[PDB]
């Protein structure tokens with residue numbers, strides 16, 4: 327059954343925490359663990375980082391933490407590095423169910439020369455590699471939390487939530503789904519439909535697949551899960567199979583859910599949104615509907631939630 331979480335007072339706040347810690351005085355958190363989430367055929371390493379904030383930096387699902395990697399800002403000598411934001415991949419209780427830790431899902435940004443394929447570590451992403459190189463006991467300068475776009479609307483505990491993720495964009499949805507299905511949260515008993523669409527390069531690049539597959543077996547009437555493996559599958563037009571192609575496979579069901587009030591969420595690569603828009607426009611046209619008018623209504627009704635970068 328559902329996992330006991332503590333402390334219940336994390337349910338008491340009526341507003342999300344925002345900017346509890348600021349860049350000039352970050353919170354010095356401590357790494358609990360770092361593990362790779364991916365197999366040897368993944369095009370790069372994505373890691374899961376558990377950070378002990380001690381209950382000092384609580385957050386709500388869908389928010390981000392800022393991380394200030396060590397060193398000086400290259401474009402401002404004597405200045406600290408700029409904050410990098412990471413969508414929190416844990417619930418407010420965290421992976422130890424105690425309100426003391428939060429987790430990040432971090433893709434290492436690695437530079438390869440486009441001609442020779444030669445790596446150049448000096449051009450690798452600073453914060454992503456800092457995080458995935460971290461070890462238990464290391465310190466992390468945390469800021470935030472921040473963000474409200476991806477807060478989970480809980481007013482209707484039987485709402486429908488359609489979650490579209492590419493890569494580490496799955497992060498907020500891991501938190502949503504743990505709150506919906508895994509944790510014993512007495513004041514939020516989810517009885518709606520949660521539908522996760524996840525796009526990753528191949529099977530080895532799947533993130534948290536065992537957890538999501540477990541929800542299919544535990545909550546078959548409340549959870550659906552579809553994957554787009556871009557380098558393992560092709561769409562009906564011959565392109566790499568992307569999440570928008572999976573959305574198209576369920577176009578009638580998704581449109582009906584949207585018409586019925588479903589929330590739809592997009593997180594991950596900003597480049598997926600033009601493709602999604604094109605697909606939804608095409609679906610709508612085949613149904614004799616205007617996607618522009620439908621999207622305008624979804625936005626007006628606060629059903630449309632996008633955080634991509």
Ligand SMILES: Cc1cc2nc3c(=O)[nH]c(=O)nc-3n(C[C@H](O)[C@H](O)[C@H](O)COP(=O)(O)OP(=O)(O)OC[C@H]3O[C@@H](n4cnc5c(N)ncnc54)[C@H](O)[C@@H]3O)c2cc1C
Nearest residue numbers: 410411412413431432433435449450451452453454494635
């Ligand atoms: C709200 C929000 C949430 C986010 N959530 C997540 C998340 O959950 N997980 C996640 O992985 N990311 C997420 N990101 C992205 C994250 O904030 C960082 O931008 C990302 O990790 C890269 O930061 P970095 O410090 O590693 O790279 P940076 O050091 O900022 O470098 C940026 C890029 O430039 C490249 N680069 C550097 N120097 C050169 C050069 N000379 N020539 C060519 N290229 C170069 C690097 O390889 C890298 O790809 C999020 C972003 C936002 C805005």
Ligand SMILES: NC(=O)c1ccc[n+]([C@@H]2O[C@H](COP(=O)([O-])OP(=O)(O)OC[C@H]3O[C@@H](n4cnc5c(N)ncnc54)[C@H](OP(=O)(O)O)[C@@H]3O)[C@@H](O)[C@H]2O)c1
Nearest residue numbers: 433492493494495526527556568594595597598633634635
């Ligand atoms: N809140 C936020 O804003 C937030 C949170 C988390 C992550 N992010 C961002 O989300 C991105 C996740 O990237 P990642 O490195 O984890 O993923 P990735 O491996 O680069 O891509 C994930 C999947 O998306 C596919 N993809 C590429 N272009 C696409 C398109 N135009 N439409 C649909 N799918 C497409 C990729 O396929 P191919 O590579 O095979 O084309 C891959 O299968 C990062 O840029 C990260 O910074 C943002």
Ligand SMILES: [Mg+2]
Nearest residue numbers: 364365530532
């Ligand atoms: Mg795997």
